[PDB]
């Protein structure tokens, strides 16, 4: 058992010691319909893009602390090209369609030995902004390698690290305390998730269909499923064990929905 050879398009990934699947909210998530708000003929799926793209994430050592997480947005990951991960043909498509709509398979990657311990937590939270400190500039591919992890401060816990706006100098400068977007780390296992540790598994999967505030959000602005990995108990290993294991990931779109041709996107 426990050997899951998943084949799509022309690629095929298997993880020999895996666990299973985990759908969300509907037992078969790939089913959908073309959106009702549009009127144009939607460009549906095609077999050249039904794919596992993979991409390297930062490694992890002794020096990490509890609740420290990486988080990658989606499909905004495909735009800025983190970790040697690009959509390739897929970005060349969704630059040219003002409406985009799709659900996601993910299986994440590690492999610790049998003389280790330490629990990760792979989960994809819905509808968050865990990539910006309030200056207004979204962080990009250069400033990922200076930290390797987000040390989980209190300002994400109290919702103080969401981008506010220019108050206008007619008023008083305020005293902010709360925002509705936050992360409560004692609570984060209410989302589709599974404990990945050196106990039983090596690589493990999530699966999720669509959620949205509208039938179809915009092309290059929305980010529904950020996925975040966070450590609950740190690693311990004696001198001679394999130092600093490596993390990558594998993202699959399922049943894409495009709408609306124009020129290739050039940012204003």
């Amino acid at each position: 058992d426990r050997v899951t050879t998943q084949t799509a398009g022309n690629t095929a990934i298997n993880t020999q010691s895996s666990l299973g699947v985990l759908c969300a909210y509907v037992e078969d998530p790939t089913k959908s319909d073309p959106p009702s708000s549009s009127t144009d003929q939607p460009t549906t799926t095609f077999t050249a893009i039904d794919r596992w793209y993979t991409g390297r994430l930062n490694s992890w050592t002794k020096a990490v602390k509890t609740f420290s997480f990486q988080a990658v947005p989606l499909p905004g990951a495909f735009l800025s090209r983190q970790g040697g991960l690009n959509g390739g043909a897929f970005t060349a498509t969704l630059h040219r369609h003002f409406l985009m709509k799709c659900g996601w398979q993910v299986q994440v990657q590690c492999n610790l030995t049998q003389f280790h311990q330490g629990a990760l937590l792979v989960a994809m939270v819905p509808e968050t902004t865990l990539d910006v400190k309030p200056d207004g500039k979204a962080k990009s591919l250069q400033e990922l390698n200076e930290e390797q992890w987000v040390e989980m401060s209190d300002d994400y816990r109290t919702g103080k690290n969401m981008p506010f706006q220019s108050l206008g100098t007619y008023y008083r400068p305020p005293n902010w305390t709360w925002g509705p977007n936050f992360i409560n780390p004692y609570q984060v296992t209410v989302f589709p998730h599974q404990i990945l540790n050196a106990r039983t598994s090596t690589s493990v999967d999530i699966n999720v269909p669509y959620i949205g505030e509208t039938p179809t959000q915009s092309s290059e602005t929305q980010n529904s499923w950020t996925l975040l990995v966070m450590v609950l108990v740190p690693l311990d290993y004696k001198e001679g064990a394999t130092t600093d294991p490596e993390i990558t990931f594998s993202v699959r779109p399922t049943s894409p929905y495009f709408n609306g041709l124009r020129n290739r996107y050039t940012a204003g």
């Binding site: 298997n14 020999q16 991409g55 030995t113 049998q114 003389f115 600093d244 294991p245 990558t248």
Partner: protein, 119 residues
């Protein structure tokens, strides 16, 4: 076929690309094309088949002029995550390679041989 200690484990992908201009070198290039990742577990191998894309149905066997009809792009394999292994067990594992005909592999029309083995 893998060969290493059972307490060691790693993730290896293998990738194939049809003839581009240059050769695909790093992981984005071998990523986009056609690949399979591979675990280390209780078994020890991973049967892979290079697909058969072609302009013409038959293909040559050696290239007198290394043209598009006789080559089909390079093959490579990359290490995706590090090999992971406990203390007091040796470094640097090993992997053997095989090569066999698939199902559709058919031959035709013989030619005179190369006697250079006898000299």
């Amino acid at each position: 076929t893998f060969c290493g200690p059972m307490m060691a484990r790693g993730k290896f992908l293998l990738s194939y690309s049809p003839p581009n201009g240059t050769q695909p070198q790093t992981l984005s290039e071998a990523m986009q094309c056609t690949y399979s990742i591979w675990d280390i577990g209780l078994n020890s191998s991973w049967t892979f088949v290079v697909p058969y894309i072609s302009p013409s149905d038959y293909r040559e066997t050696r290239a007198i002029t290394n043209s598009v009809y006789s080559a089909d792009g390079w093959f490579s394999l990359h290490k995706l995550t590090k090999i992971t292994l406990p203390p007091d067990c040796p470094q640097s594992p090993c992997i053997l390679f095989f090569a066999s005909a698939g199902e559709d592999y058919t031959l035709r029309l013989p030619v005179d041989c190369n006697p250079s083995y006898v000299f």
